[PDB]
């Protein structure tokens, strides 16, 4: 016991100023604790205002706080338990359990703020991670070790998509996985924890393959602003010290930026554009750059990205693009056609779509599919105005083929059975390319449009074609 | 506030609380601050529209834009059975009715 | 000392209290601070010449030094108070520095607050519980003109029911 | 009304004594990458300083009572009351050829595990642009290898051509192919003909940079390139500084009778950085919360690029700033400033990109104010017609949907083929003597017969045939740089022979 | 000789302190001497307590607080008269063409008073330019202002030179070309092209004085150059 004490001097919403004796201040990013009637209240030092006073941010609700109340310096950043002991557990922002299964009995804890790996620690690999999802694996294929963002305005299917990923990827994956819930719906989290148990991925009386870190929107900005790093640290630990493969699921990473937004002014910063904090770029940088494959081990991350007001050029998402190896852009226009997943086949991109990585044929199919749809998009002016009548014959066929193709890009997810009542179909990457190849050369021009919609591989196109013609 | 609505588990008494917040837009703009906020907080929306209203659709629900994210899970089985595909169909209908303008 | 007293404007008198609390120099500072305020407010002469945003750095320092050599109690550490406010442009709020000096002596060597009517006694014994009880009985009987709190509370309860 | 500096703690020091320390400064407060410091009274504006913990920072606001220093590292390192030391040093950087093939951060530090930089000297990050007098008119080509660019948007040495488009359109690819195409000369002997590459990476994912390195080394381009790296996660000052830092690296070559070219990837993100600093320093904001001098920021940068006059060693510095539009908005605050500083733009569009036209160059929107003067005379010889044809092809384009007269039919016949001819897989830039034949057979109507899908294999087979059976004409183009009346009949004959075959 | 001290440096904004009622008026030129030559500061405000706020005419890197600052006792002034023809001058009236100082007989403040309502022209009047298109269709005001539109590829500078020549030849008056926010490349072009066209005559006589204020110069500089030239 050599404990440092301070006193609360202000509370303004989520900002709590604390005062300490002579030059003996806890450093920025340190955690402080206040022992309250129910549990404790964690603070995080944000500035040194001067005159022995610090500005903090609260990892909880600040009501009930009394000025002049004792504050305690933990001596360092917020700590999380790490390692295999977090497997099968649910954790809140401050490395405390919320599953009521008792205390997380790990040997090490770790600071949630940490430095991002040096330029010289980086590891470039063009390896390909098969999703099972036709449009991704064909057009914008996800990279093992990569980073992978899912852009989408509200309710276009991000969370469902990401769960379809977990449904597939997270079984076939030999290693461990962290899921971070950053400012989503407490009930979504509820489902996941009950799915994990039933998929088997979690097992409360045996071995588990995943850690759960939650900080949903029912929680104040400070909390919603750090729980990403809480999760991210657990991952880091398996990457660097279990020297192995991780899968890092963040839903939804936009709320890290938003939460940053909600306290910015209370910390006394002039707003930048679209009323976002001045530190948007570097703050996102300072997090994203830790989520990374390095020589000690590999992370592969799937981050849902909320696109506010469906505006992609909104400073927040617009910044995130630079951070991802593969971008899956969900579109309202697409989803409104009943085409699930709502993936925009043109605006979606992945670095791995290069002949050197996937072969020429794959790259050629993928390019042609794109040309097709691009043409079909370009002609939608002349179709509206002068009908389908006023068209070149090649064009008439390009459109015929584009429409058939649009549909073959949809697919029943397993997760989304509640919505389609249609059984989840998973498609193999080679089966994807072959069927699109076939479609493209016209070896299927006779089959009606509906036969390609909400089915798996070309088997299912034939099966449906006949079942309907019956 | 809105998270305070939930459907408790059996251990906790199975009680529910269900929320219908209301939000008023201007000039149909849903991309203004607050609506955007709440739109992404809730489990779906019902969009009402003035144009729809005056041409006689009342409730002036906009099927095109209205969703319930729970979906069929909360429909009555009978209603579900005969409503198979209606919402998608009603979309296809606006589709053909837009092409009708030619 | 634990008195707070703001933190930007109230720190003027607290800064010099640290140097004046050595070798018994707090007693002479009370009577010297009162002479600076009294010869500027009810004098009409050096007030209008110092409250303006003219003069200079050297001119403000010479005026303070010439007044202090002929006035009562200004030969110790009192000369240094006026110099600091001249260069930093703080001579306009001379009443604030003198007021916040007196509150230090009365808090660490006396009571404060109030009770009812006018002021209380403000004893310098020790604990506030044993002081307030022995002074309330002696001040209620002697004087107490009484020129209502109990009547106002009773009326409000009957109108709400 | 109230002010900082002397407050409570700092105010209870001058009352007891007006001396204390005979000196350095003391941090009054710290947060958000900014630290306010008392004293350091002799400090110069933009002097680098050092903190007790060892993190460096620079002094930007010099205020009555305090200095406003911006941090280069995490401010967790800094505490209130800490000691700060002048380094008496305006930000500078090591410069000189010992830097070629190296990957540095914005202060000149080595970030690639290859030991200390061997600096020919040091230059301040800030330097006056070459004035009105010590410049000559741009006259030597930067040959990028890209058919579309070299032929239609010719870049001169000393020029400032701006690469602009939305995200993911191909901006970096254009720059990188310019860099990859310099092997032609950099591997040779003749100094005046080589060109050293400087790639300023701003706020990029380190793994990206790593891979951009792993890409030039895969083309043996590293040996004559310099990467100044100011990655996503680094202090804003470094992201603000990097381009000036790298600017001064380029000028070394400029000032020394040599030639560099410098790619700024990107200026968008530099402006964002400058913004962060200012707002935090609570400098007053304007349009989109940028400070008044955000223009002045970029003007200073790009005016430093030039073709110096004979008296100055005739060296040169060419500039490829990258600017990222948002949904195509050229009116956007930053793109406006920059567009009005540069000598033109190479313009990218995802539309053209998904059509499959790569490089995705909008020709109608791309200009090079320098233009004519900077083109391999030979390429300019067989292409004065090219901008003409593709102009008229843009105007009869919508006629692609049954009853067109033979004139506007023909115009659609060239256009498709021509557009096809300017597609070019990544990383494969073409030698001039390899461009001029294809652009010749195109413009003079030797492809109208050929179908539009075969224009792919056409180029490959033509060039390899020209190599074996006409290596001599190719050699003359590469050497003479112009086309004889004889050479025009030579090529014509060799073409008509290949097109017949 | 009035002297001050630098008390604040913030980008192109410098703050200078002074002694009792010596403060220069607003719009005065204050000089700091640099290793190169001289940095000029224009006064924007008397903030009180003997302090003035200035805007720089050049960079401020290297300024140290408490540095000597001289008052010129006037606004920024330029050389005027014949001695400026064929010369290149900058915002603060300095030769930038490396051909010595302009040896003018006077110097005049860049800030001045517009000709009173008395000194006014009662009638509008055409200025003859000699260009058919212009005179016939879009004739110029004498003492008027003509908005010239169009970028490059349209012989703008040739046309400008034509008017400089024609106003000199037909009427008998000089011209002042001011480059506000100049791209420096084009300053080097113009200057050469003018010599090449002999409207500038290093050996004989020029018809035009050149006052450049390029992009790279800081916001204060770029604001004043128009006046710098106009004064001339
Ligand atoms: N594959 C799918 N099939 C059918 N319906 C889907 C699919 N994906 C999404 N939806 C529908 O769209 C709704 C929203 O899905 P959801 O994944 O919650 O969108 P979201 O973009 O994650 N919402 P948010 O997290 O606020 O941005 C659901 O209730 C489903 O009806
Ligand atoms: N000529 C080309 N042929 C084929 N592919 C290309 C070509 N140019 C670019 N690409 C590809 O298209 C994608 C976009 O190119 P890129 O150089 O990243 O543009 P960018 O503006 O730098 N995108 P970013 O800066 O990351 O927002 C890359 O993934 C490349 O693999
Ligand atoms: Mg969701
Ligand atoms: Mg790029």
3 state SS of D189: coil
| Binding site per annotation, positions of E for ATP | 150-157
D336, D466: one domain = no
Is the CB of A420 within 6 Å of ligand 1?
yes
How far apart (Å, rounded) are the C-alpha atoms in residues D6 and D1?
A: 14
Count how many Cα atoms sit within 13 Å of the Cα of residue A80 in the half-sphere of its side chain.
Answer: 32
| Long-range interactions of E166-175: CB distance < 8 A, separation 24+ | E166/E129, E166/E130, E166/E131, E167/E127, E167/E129, E168/E207, E169/E130, E170/E128, E170/E130, E171/E127, E171/E128, E174/E85, E174/E207, E174/E208, E174/E209, E175/E207, E175/E208, E175/E209
A206, A297: one domain = yes
Q: What is the 3-state secondary structure (H, E, C) of chain A?
A: CCCCEEEEEEEECCEEEEEECCCCCCCCCCEEEEECCCCEEEEEEEEEEECCEEEEEECCCCCCCCCCCEEEECCCCCEEECCHHHCCCEECCCCCECCCCCCCCCCCEEECCCCCCCHHHECCCCCECCCCCHHHHHHCCCECCCEEEEEECCCCCHHHHHHHHHHHHHHHCCCEEEEEEECCCHHHHHHHHHHHHHHCCCCCCCCCCEEEEEECCCCCHHHHCCHHHHHHHHHHHHHHCCCCEEEEEEECCHHHHHHHHHHHCCCCCCCCHHHCCCCHHHHHHHHHCCCCCECCEEEEEEEEEECHHHCCCCHHHHHHHHHCCEEEEECHHHHCCCCCCCECCCCCEECCCCHHHHCHHHHHHHHHHHHHHHHHHHHHHHHHHHCCCCCCHHHHHHHHHHHHHHHHCCCCCCCCHHHHCCCCCCCCHHHHHHHHHHHHCCCCCCCCHHHHCCCCCHHHHHHHHHHHHC
D361, D403: one domain = no
Of the residues A322, A352, A382, which one is the last residue of a structural domain? Answer: A352
Mutate to test the interface with B, among A309, A380, A388, A417 (most CBs of B within 10 A): A309
Q: Which residue has the tokens 């008023």?
A: B24
CATH number for the domain that contains residue E32? 2.40.10.170
List the domain range (segments joined by +) for residue C99: 10-108
How far apart (Å, rounded) are the C-alpha atoms in residues D444 and D440?
A: 6
Q: Is D373 on the interface with E (CB under 8 A)?
A: no
Nearest-neighbour CA in chain E from D220: distance (Å): 34
Q: Whose CA is nearest to atom 22 of ligand 2?
A: D172
Q: Which residues of B touch A183 (CB under 8 A)?
A: none
Going edge to edge, which strands form the sheet with A326-329? A90-91, A210-215, A176-182, A245-251, A298-306, A147-152, A326-329, A349-350
How far apart (Å, rounded) are the C-alpha atoms in residues A97 and A103?
A: 7
Calculate how far, in angstroms, residue A222's C-alpha sits from the geometric centre of ligand 3. 21
Element (H, E) at E33: strand E29-33
Is the CB of D429 within 6 Å of ligand 2?
no
D11–C12 CB contact, under 8 Å = yes
Q: Which residue has the tokens 């964002």?
A: D272
D35, D73: one domain = yes
| Residue A268 among known ligand-binding residues | no
Of the residues D375, D394, D428, which one is the last residue of a structural domain? Answer: D375
Q: Is C19 on the interface with D (CB under 8 A)?
A: yes
Write out residues 218-237 of D within 8 Å (CB-CB) of E: none
Contact D281, D288 (CB under 8 A): no
Active site residues of B: 69
The burial class, CB within 10 Å (0-12 / 13-18 / 19+), for A118 is exposed
Contact D216, D92 (CB under 8 A): no
How many domains does chain D contain in total?
Answer: 3
Q: Which residues of A touch D81 (CB under 8 A)?
A: 23
Q: Which residues of D touch A349 (CB under 8 A)?
A: 168
Of the residues D327, D351, D375, which one is the last residue of a structural domain? Answer: D375
Q: Indicate the pairing of strand A210-215 with strand A176-182.
A: parallel
The tokens for D197 are 């590459």
| Residue A156 among known ligand-binding residues | yes
Of the residues D55, D89, D123, which one is the last residue of a structural domain? Answer: D89
Q: Which residues of D touch C81 (CB under 8 A)?
A: 15
CA-nearest of E138, E211, E208 to E173 is E208
CATH number for the domain that contains residue C64? 1.10.520.20
C–D CB contacts, 8 A cutoff, strictly below: 30
A283, A427: one domain = no
Is the CB of A419 within 6 Å of ligand 1?
yes
Distances from the Cα of A148 to the Cαs of A299, A322, C74, D43, in angstroms? 11, 11, 76, 47
Ligand 1: which atom is nearest the Cα of residue A158?
22
Within D367-405, residue ranges assigned H as helices are 377-381, 386-395
Is the CB of A155 within 6 Å of ligand 1?
yes
A–B CB contacts, 8 A cutoff, strictly below: 42
Is the CB of A157 within 6 Å of ligand 1?
yes
Is the CB of D358 within 6 Å of ligand 2?
yes
| Residue A158 among known ligand-binding residues | yes
Q: Which residues of C touch E48 (CB under 8 A)?
A: 53
Q: Is E19 on the interface with C (CB under 8 A)?
A: yes
How far apart (Å, rounded) are the C-alpha atoms in residues E128 and E139?
A: 7
**Resolution value (Å, 1 decimal):** 3.6
Q: Which of D148, D149, D164, D170 to mutate to test the pocket of ligand 2 (most atoms within 8 A of CB)?
A: D170
Q: Is D20 on the interface with C (CB under 8 A)?
A: no
List the domain range (segments joined by +) for residue D402: 376-501
Q: Which residues of B touch A311 (CB under 8 A)?
A: 31
CATH number for the domain that contains residue A433? 1.10.1140.10
D283–E10 CB contact, under 8 Å = yes
Q: Cis omega (within 30 of 0) on the bond before D266? A: yes
Who's near A379: CB < 8 A, 6+ residues apart? Answer: A391, A395, A398, A399, D401
Of the residues A352, A382, A399, which one is the last residue of a structural domain? Answer: A352
List the domain range (segments joined by +) for residue A307: 78-352
CATH number for the domain that contains residue D273? 3.40.50.300
CA-nearest of D235, D246, D374, D367 to D302 is D246
A291, A157: one domain = yes
How many domains does chain A contain in total?
Answer: 3
Of the residues A312, A336, A352, which one is the last residue of a structural domain? Answer: A352
Write out residues 20-39 of D within 8 Å (CB-CB) of A: 27-33, 36
- Sign of the alpha-carbon torsion through D283, D286, D289, D294: negative
The burial class, CB within 10 Å (0-12 / 13-18 / 19+), for A457 is buried
How far apart (Å, rounded) are the C-alpha atoms in residues E165 and E130?
A: 10
Q: Which of D138, D299, D369 sits opposite E216 (nearest CB)?
A: D299
Annotated active-site residue in A185, A368, A403, A428: A185
Q: Is A262 on the interface with B (CB under 8 A)?
A: no
Q: Indicate if E156 belongs to the active site.
A: yes
The tokens for C2 are 């634990």
Nearest-neighbour CA in chain B from A157: distance (Å): 10
A154–B39 CB contact, under 8 Å = yes
Is the CB of D42 within 6 Å of ligand 2?
no
DSSP bridge partners of E31: E40, E70
């Amino acid at each position: 016991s050599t404990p440092i004490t301070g006193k609360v001097t202000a509370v303004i919403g989520a900002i709590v100023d604390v005062h300490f004796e002579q030059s003996e201040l806890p450093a920025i990013l340190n955690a402080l604790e206040i022992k309250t009637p129910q549990g404790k209240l964690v603070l995080e030092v944000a500035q040194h205002l001067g005159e022995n006073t610090v500005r903090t941010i609260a990892m909880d609700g600040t009501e009930g706080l009394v000025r002049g109340e004792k504050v305690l310096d933990t001596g360092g950043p917020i700590s999380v338990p790490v390692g295999r002991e977090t497997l099968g557990r649910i954790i809140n922002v401050i490395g405390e359990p919320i599953d009521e299964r008792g205390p997380i009995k790990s040997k090490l804890r770790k600071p949630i703020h940490a430095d991002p790996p040096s330029f010289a620690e980086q590891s470039t690999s063009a390896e390909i991670l098969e999703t099972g999802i036709k449009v991704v694996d064909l057009l914008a294929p996800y990279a093992r070790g990569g980073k992978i963002g899912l852009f989408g305005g509200a309710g276009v299917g991000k969370t469902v998509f990401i769960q379809e990923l977990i449904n597939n990827i997270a079984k076939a994956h030999g290693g461990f996985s962290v899921f971070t819930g950053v400012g989503e719906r407490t009930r979504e989290g509820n489902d996941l924890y009950r799915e994990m148990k039933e998929t088997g991925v979690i097992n409360l009386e045996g071995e588990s393959k995943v850690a759960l870190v939650f900080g949903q929107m029912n929680e104040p900005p400070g909390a919603r602003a750090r729980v990403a790093l809480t999760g991210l640290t657990i991952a880091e630990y398996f990457r660097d010290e279990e020297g192995q493969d991780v899968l890092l699921f963040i839903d939804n990473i936009f709320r890290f930026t938003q939460a940053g937004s909600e306290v910015s002014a209370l910390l006394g910063r002039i707003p930048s554009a679209v009323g976002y904090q001045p530190t948007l770029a570097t703050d996102m940088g300072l997090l994203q750059e830790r989520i990374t494959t390095t020589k000690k081990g590999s992370v592969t991350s799937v981050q849902a990205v909320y696109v506010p007001a469906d505006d992609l050029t909104d400073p927040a998402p617009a910044t995130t693009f630079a951070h991802l190896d593969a971008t899956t852009v969900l579109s309202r226009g697409i989803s409104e056609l009943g085409i699930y997943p709502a993936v925009d086949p043109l605006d979606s991109k992945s670095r791995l779509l290069d002949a050197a990585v996937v072969g020429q044929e794959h790259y050629d199919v993928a390019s042609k599919v794109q040309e097709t749809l691009q043409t079909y998009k370009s002609l939608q002016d002349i179709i509206a105005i002068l009908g389908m009548d006023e068209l070149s014959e090649q064009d008439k066929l390009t459109v015929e083929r584009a429409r058939k193709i649009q549909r073959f890009l949809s697919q029943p997810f397993a997760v989304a059975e509640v919505f389609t009542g249609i059984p989840g179909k998973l498609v193999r990457l080679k089966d994807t390319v072959a069927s699109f190849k076939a479609v493209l050369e016209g070896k299927y021009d006779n089959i009606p449009e509906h036969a390609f919609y909400m089915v798996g591989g070309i088997e299912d196109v034939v099966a449906k074609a006949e079942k309907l013609a019956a | 506030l809105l998270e305070r609505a939930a459907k408790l588990s059996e251990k906790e008494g199975s009680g529910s609380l269900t929320a219908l917040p209301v939000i008023e837009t201007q000039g149909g703009d849903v991309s203004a601050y607050i609506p955007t906020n709440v739109i992404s907080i809730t489990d779906g929306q019902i969009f009402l529209e003035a144009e729809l209203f005056y041409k006689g659709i009342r409730p002036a629900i906009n099927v095109g834009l209205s969703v319930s994210r729970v979906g069929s899970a909360a429909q009555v089985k009978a209603l579900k059975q005969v409503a198979g595909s209606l919402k998608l169909f009603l979309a296809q209908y606006r589709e053909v009715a837009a092409f009708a303008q030619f | 000392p634990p008195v707070r007293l703001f933190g930007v404007e109230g720190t003027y008198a607290t800064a010099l209290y640290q140097a004046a609390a050595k070798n018994s120099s707090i007693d002479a500072a009370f009577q010297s601070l009162q002479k600076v305020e009294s010869t500027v407010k009810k004098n009409p002469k050096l007030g209008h010449l110092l409250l303006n945003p003219a003069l200079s750095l050297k001119d403000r320092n010479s005026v303070i030094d010439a007044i202090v050599e002929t006035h009562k109690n200004l030969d110790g550490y009192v000369v240094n108070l006026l110099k600091v406010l001249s260069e930093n442009n703080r001579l306009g709020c001379f009443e604030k520095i003198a007021s916040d000096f007196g509150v230090l002596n009365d808090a660490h060597n006396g009571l404060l607050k109030g009770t009812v009517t006018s002021a209380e006694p403000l004893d310098p014994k020790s604990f506030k519980r044993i002081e307030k009880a022995l002074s309330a009985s002696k001040l209620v009987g002697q004087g107490k003109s009484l020129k209502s709190t109990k009547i106002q509370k009773l009326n409000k309860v009957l109108e709400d029911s | 009304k109230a002010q900082p500096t002397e407050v409570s703690s700092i105010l209870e020091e001058r009352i007891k004594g007006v001396s204390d320390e005979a000196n350095t400064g003391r941090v009054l407060a710290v947060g958000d990458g900014i630290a306010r410091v008392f004293g350091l009274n002799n400090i110069q504006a933009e002097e680098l300083v050092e903190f007790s913990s060892g993190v460096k920072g620079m002094a930007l606001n010099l205020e009555p009572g305090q200095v406003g220093i911006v941090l280069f590292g995490s401010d967790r390192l800094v505490k209130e009351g800490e000691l700060v030391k002048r380094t008496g040093n305006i930000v500078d950087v090591p410069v000189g050829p010992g830097l070629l093939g190296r990957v540095v951060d914005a202060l000149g530090n080595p970030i690639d595990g290859k030991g200390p930089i061997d600096a020919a000297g040091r230059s301040r990050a800030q330097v006056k642009a070459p004035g009105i007098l010590p410049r000559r008119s741009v006259h030597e080509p930067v040959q990028t290898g890209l058919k579309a660019v070299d032929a239609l948007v010719p870049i001169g040495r000393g020029q400032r051509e701006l690469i602009i488009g939305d995200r993911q359109t191909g901006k970096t690819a254009v720059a990188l192919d310019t860099i990859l195409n310099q092997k032609r000369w950099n591997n040779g002997s003749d100094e005046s003909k080589k060109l050293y590459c400087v790639y300023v990476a701003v706020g990029q994912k380190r793994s990206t940079v790593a891979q951009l390195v792993q890409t030039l080394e895969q083309h043996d381009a590293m040996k004559y390139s310099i990467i100044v790296a100011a990655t996503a996660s680094e202090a804003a000052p470094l992201q603000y500084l990097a381009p000036f830092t790298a600017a001064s690296i380029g000028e070394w070559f400029r000032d020394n009778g040599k030639h560099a070219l410098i790619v700024y990837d990107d200026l968008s993100k530099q402006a964002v950085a400058y913004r962060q600093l200012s707002l935090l320093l609570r400098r007053p904001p304007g349009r989109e919360a940028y400070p008044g001098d955000v223009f002045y920021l970029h003007s200073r940068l790009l005016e430093r690029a030039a073709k110096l006059s004979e008296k100055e060693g005739s060296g040169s510095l060419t500039a490829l700033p990258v600017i990222e539009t948002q949904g195509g908005d050229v009116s956007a605050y930053i793109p406006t400033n920059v567009i009005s500083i540069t000598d033109g733009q190479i313009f990218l569009e995802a539309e053209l990109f998904y059509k499959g036209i790569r490089p995705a160059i909008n020709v109608g929107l791309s200009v090079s104010r320098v233009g004519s003067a900077a083109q391999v005379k030979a390429l300019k010889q067989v292409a004065g017609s090219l901008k003409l044809f593709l102009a008229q092809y843009r105007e009869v384009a919508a006629f692609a949907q049954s009853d067109l007269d033979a004139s506007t039919k023909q115009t659609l016949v060239r256009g498709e083929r021509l557009t096809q001819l300017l597609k070019q897989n990544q990383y494969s830039p073409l030698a001039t003597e390899e461009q001029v034949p294809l652009i010749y057979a195109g413009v003079n109507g030797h492809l109208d017969g050929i179908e539009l899908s075969r224009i792919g294999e056409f180029e490959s087979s033509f060039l390899s045939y020209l190599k074996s059976n006409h290596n001599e004409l190719l050699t003359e183009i590469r050497e003479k740089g112009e086309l004889s009346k004889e050479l025009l009949a030579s090529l014509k004959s060799a073409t008509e022979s290949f097109v017949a075959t």
